[PDB]
Symmetry: C8
Subunit: 182 residues, 8 copies
């Protein structure tokens, strides 16, 4: 008798663990990031950092005046239980500064929410974790509750918005400070 | 013998809970919101608040004279048992007021029904919970029973309708007070 | 032994209740309502009432001379065991009266059959239950057995037909009293 | 022991009744009825009666000289075990008579076969059961064995055919008596 | 114990009978019959008889000089274990005779094979069983082994072929006796 | 106890026989036969014989100068365990001889291989078994190992090839003896 | 008791053998062979030999100056556990020699790897096993590691490459010795 | 009793091993490698080496001025638990050096990450393992964290990027040293 209830309990347990790992594998997170360059300067040397998740495509090397970044990052495949969270940065040699854009689309919406930010750092810098913790904690991010606007200095500003869901769209326009948004 | 009826009862229970969570995951709620700007003024600084549910796309930053918002919010993914309920708001600098539009598509139609409303608040204001409780309780909403019309002051009015189902369409035209609807 | 036949009887019972609720969910009722405005007057302020069922789309605000309502109502989703039954009404300010159109596509064809009607009430009135009980009991409805024709007064009449099935099509032409149907 | 063979016999019985009702639901009957108006007169006030089965579309109100009825009736949904059997009738005011067309596509081809007929009654009459029993028993119908032809009086005749299967096509041309068929 | 092996044997038996009736339902027989009218005479009053099987479409009333019959008959739906076997006949008033075409596509190819024939009978005659037994037994049919040719009298002949399989194609050209086939 | 292992062994046996007959039903054999008429003579009275397998389409009655036979034969449906093997023959009245083409695509490639042949017999002859045994045993066939060429007499030759698999393509060009192949 | 564990072990064994034969049936091998004729001579009398595997299409009889062989061979259907390995040969009468091309795409990549070769033999020769063992062992083949080049004598050379996988592409250009590859 | 729990444990074990090998078979790795030739020199004699994985297509023999390599390598089919890792190399006779490009897309991202590199070796050299260990360990590779740039000598440089995921895209532009990237 007794080994039959052990094998039956083993099949019940793998029935639970199969459904658990198939749920965590089918819970999806992504952020379609559009950054639109109305700045009047060429961006170059495009770099990216992921705290969580990844892209399949490359970021483009450069954005000319009036062109856009259109970049699609997504969470890791399989039952990973992490969101998509990262930095995108470009150097702007016409002003000697690097624009960094951050997004955060979490896995668990009880603990976290969608956040985004952008800032214009001094010099040429690669995108890395020190920009993520700054753009997420040391400077005020935005809640994904519609459109927001902020100055960058050097005659620049941005306006942008993010959708509040796990399939997110982030849209930013980087503009001259003297001009109307969108 | 006895552990075999415990594992059989465990599989019966997970058979119930699988069918329960698959029912709550496949019960769908959405509201296709169209707001049409026949106002003669440019709307800007678009903001949104969700009491329940979310959008995937962004709301557009601005609506010019004769253009429309076309915005699609939907309930949260998975077995959540909540509807889609929210506010949409734009600033109108030509009059110094913010138009806020509200919809409410509930999960459980025994307790609740489809409602919508719109109002024109003083000053520039972000969309938030204080507009939701006002547009839903402190001002009279509309029952989703065909077309309705109301004045906003400052030479504006709206007419609109909402469908009575869980896949809802809300349509609003915002107009000069002196002009015929649709 | 005995608890094994209780769990086997529980699985038999949920096998019955699953097939019952899947039958009631897949039994479908709808009425494609076409109302064609050959009246020579503009209709406006479109309203609708459901005794049973719902639409997904909005009814259009107004119908001009030579245009049509094309409106699709359907029963509630899931295992609800109710048909689609309702009123549609428009105000006609050129004569000071409201045209109301009624349809009734029942769930259970042993007790009920497809019925429709139309009438032209005095003044501006919203579509509601008092028009449903009138158009269904206090005035003679039509059996869905081919084409029928009736005068409305104020120089108007209608002709129309309804198909006899649970996927119904209702077609009405509203005409000048002095003119030939279709 | 004994309750286990009762639940096993209950599942065997619902396995039979599921396969029985799925067979009766998937056994399909329909009749694509074409009636072609080479009569030189306008037909109007189109009416229909079903002894068994139904249509989804409406019959058209009128047929002008050289136009056709193209009408699709079918058996009732689900495990109903009845065919499609009915009358179609139009008034012809140029002669003061009503053309009635009958078809009969049975469920059980051991007891029954495909039959059709047409006749030209005096006056304006609605399509009903008294025309069905007449067109099926009191006047000689046609066996669905190729093309047949018959005079109607008032200078009219018809020729037509019906296919011998449960997915039937009925084709009739109504003609001047002095002219060649098809 | 014993009733459990009776219910197990009942489920084994319905497992056999399900597979038997699904095999007999999916064994398909059809004959695409093309009869091409190079005769120089109009054919009319088209009739058909089935010993076994049926068509869904109608046979056309008439074939003019240079036109074709293209007619598709098939076995009865479900587990019927019968082939498709029939006669097609037209009257030819220019000579006072009726052309009859026969095909036979059997269910069981151990007992039977594909056969076809055609003959030109005196007078106007409906297609029926007396033509089937004549065209199949009292006159020599053709084996479905490529092209064959035969005179009909009255200045006519035919040439034709049939494919040897259960999805059959029969092709016949009816010609002036003085002219080359195909 | 004992009848339960008999019913379990019966279900095991029908599990084997189902998989056996589904394997023999899904093992497929066909030969796409192209015969290209560069002969300078019209071929006519096309005939065919199958030792094994069948076609669905008809062979064409005649091939004119520069036209092709394109003919598709295939094994019998269901679990038959036989290949496709046959003769195709046409009469050539310009020389008083009949061209016969043979192919053999076997079921079991341990015992057999793909073979083909062609020969030009005296007089008008129907395609039959005496041509099959001649073209397969009494004259040397070709192994399906690329292109081969042979004279026919009367100023004709052929060149052709066959693919070595169970989905076979046979291609033959029949040519004047004085001309280059393909 | 004991016969129940024998039938359970029989079903376990056929569960293994079903999965084994379905794995060996779905492991696929093919070689898309392109041979491009920049030689300045016409190739003719195309022949082929398979050590393992087969083609469905025919090899073309001849390749003119500037045309290509495009030939697709593949392993045998079902659970055969053999790769695709063969020779292709053409006669070149302008020089009195036959070009033979060899490929080898094995089943088991632990024992074997992709190999290919080509050589220009004296006289007209059919493709056979003596060319396979020569092109694979008696002359040095190429490893499928990118592009390779070799002289053939008579003023010819080739360059070619093969991909390293079980779905292989072989590309060869046959050229004048005095000219640049691809 | 006891053999029944052994066969039940055997089926549990093959249930685990089936799910294990189906997971390792459906975990996919690939690298879409684009190498863009803005060098002003023709590349030729294209070669490739795989440490792990394979391509289906061939690498092109040569790249002219302004053309691109577009090459798709992928991991081995089935449950192999290895990534895709390799070298691509071309000779550049205008400078007497060979460009080698390396990528590494690992299976297990706990131990490893995406890496790439490129270098310009002296002389004509085939792509092999000595270039892989050099490009991966003896020269500094790049982390797949956005765009990077490096000089090659002989008046050349490259810029490129790689995406950080298991479905990777590698993009490299090879340029004159005096010119701006992308
Ligand atoms: C004793 C041990 C046995 C117990 C466990 C055995 C269970 C096997 C578990 C199977 C795990 C699941 C195996 C693998 C992969 C999943 O990634 C896919 C993807 O799904 P998607 O296309 O919908 O979208 C996902 C999109 N992202 C890429 C995540 C962003 N499923
Ligand atoms: C002991 C514990 C075990 C018991 C529980 C194990 C059961 C696993 C439950 C699986 C839950 C269900 C897992 C997940 C997701 C569902 O969201 C989808 C979506 O469905 P949709 O495409 O039709 O539309 C939905 C559209 N909205 C987005 C909701 C607006 N299914
Ligand atoms: C742990 C145990 C759980 C496992 C079993 C759970 C039961 C599964 C089956 C229940 C699925 C239930 C799926 C149901 C429903 C909603 O989708 C629809 C959508 O409405 P609409 O979009 O069309 O618009 C029309 C609505 N108004 C016009 C505005 C009124 N709403 C309704 O009101 C119908 C609900 C009417 C449906 C209520 C009747 C269902 C009763 C189920 C009892 C079964 C259990 C008995 C014990
Ligand atoms: C102990 C309790 C457990 C017992 C009950 C568990 C059983 C779960 C029941 C599942 C209920 C069924 C769950 C839900 C929904 C059905 O609405 C769909 C729709 O079907 P449709 O697309 O064909 O057309 C329907 C079209 N209308 C919209 C009705 C007009 N199925
Ligand atoms: C103890 C009680 C339990 C025993 C019974 C439980 C069994 C549930 C039975 C399910 C009944 C079957 C439930 C319902 C519907 C069928 O109508 C569809 C339609 O099929 P169709 O698309 O192929 O064409 C049919 C076309 N017509 C419309 C008939 C003309 N199936
Ligand atoms: C105790 C009694 C229970 C035992 C029996 C219960 C078993 C139910 C049997 C189901 C019978 C099968 C039920 C019905 C229909 C079959 O006709 C389709 C058609 O198939 P087709 O589309 O491939 O082509 C067929 C084309 N023709 C029309 C035949 C010419 N299947
Ligand atoms: C109650 C028990 C019943 C359950 C099991 C029933 C068995 C199911 C499997 C049988 C399906 C059987 C399905 C079979 C067949 C017909 O479709 C084909 C169609 O032919 P064609 O259109 O291609 O043209 C080619 C024909 N000619 C060239 C003119 C000769 N005809 C044949 O002759 C082949 C039959 C040759 C096939 C005969 C061999 C099958 C033998 C089955 C024995 C299994 C039972 C043993 C006990
Ligand atoms: C005690 C008796 C019971 C044991 C046997 C019961 C088992 C039923 C057997 C079912 C037999 C199988 C029943 C029937 C038919 C097969 O012909 C199809 C066709 O397959 P295809 O489309 O892939 O290509 C085949 C193409 N050709 C035409 C062969 C040339 N399957
Ligand atoms: C006691 C005996 C019983 C034990 C064995 C019973 C098990 C039955 C085995 C079934 C064997 C498998 C039966 C047959 C065929 C397979 O060929 C297909 C093809 O697959 P494909 O389309 O993916 O590509 C394959 C492409 N090539 C052609 C190989 C090159 N499956
Ligand atoms: C009677 C019992 C039998 C039932 C169970 C049988 C096992 C089923 C699962 C095995 C399916 C196995 C299916 C496998 C494989 C071939 O398709 C690939 C194709 O390669 P390519 O085309 O991509 O080119 C890349 C190749 N090179 C670059 C040139 C090297 N070749 C390989 O080398 C990978 C094999 C690597 C795979 C080897 C690892 C599998 C080990 C299985 C052990 C399970 C049993 C343990 C007891
Ligand atoms: C006692 C022994 C029995 C235990 C084991 C029996 C289990 C059989 C195992 C079956 C192994 C699995 C059998 C075979 C193949 C897999 O390769 C496919 C491919 O999947 P894909 O299309 O999604 O992408 C894969 C793409 N790459 C090519 C990998 C790059 N599945
Ligand atoms: C059958 C009994 C002994 C169970 C033992 C499990 C072992 C033998 C099975 C289970 C999983 C299998 C391994 C899982 C997959 C891989 C990784 C692959 O790159 C090589 C084969 C290899 C290494 C398999 C070899 C055999 C294996 C290790």
């Amino acid at each position: 008798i007794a080994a039959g209830t052990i094998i039956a309990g083993a099949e019940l347990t793998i029935g639970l663990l199969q459904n658990l790992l198939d749920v965590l594998a089918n819970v999806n997170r992504k952020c379609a990031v559009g950054v639109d360059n109305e700045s009047g300067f060429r961006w170059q040397e495009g770099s990216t950092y992921f705290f969580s998740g990844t892209a399949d495509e490359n970021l483009p090397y450069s954005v000319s005046d009036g062109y856009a970044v259109l970049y699609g990052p997504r969470k890791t495949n399989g039952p990973v239980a992490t969101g998509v969270v990262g930095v995108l940065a470009y150097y702007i040699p016409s002003i000697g500064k690097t624009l960094a854009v951050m997004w955060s689309v979490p896995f668990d919406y009880n603990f976290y929410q969608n956040w985004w930010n952008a800032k214009l750092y001094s010099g040429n810098q690669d995108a890395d974790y020190d920009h993520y913790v700054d753009l997420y904690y040391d400077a005020n991010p935005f809640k994904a509750n519609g459109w927001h606007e902020r100055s960058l200095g050097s005659g620049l500003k941005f306006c942008g918005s993010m959708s509040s869901s796990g399939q997110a769209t982030l849209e930013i326009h980087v503009l001259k400070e003297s001009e109307t948004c969108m």
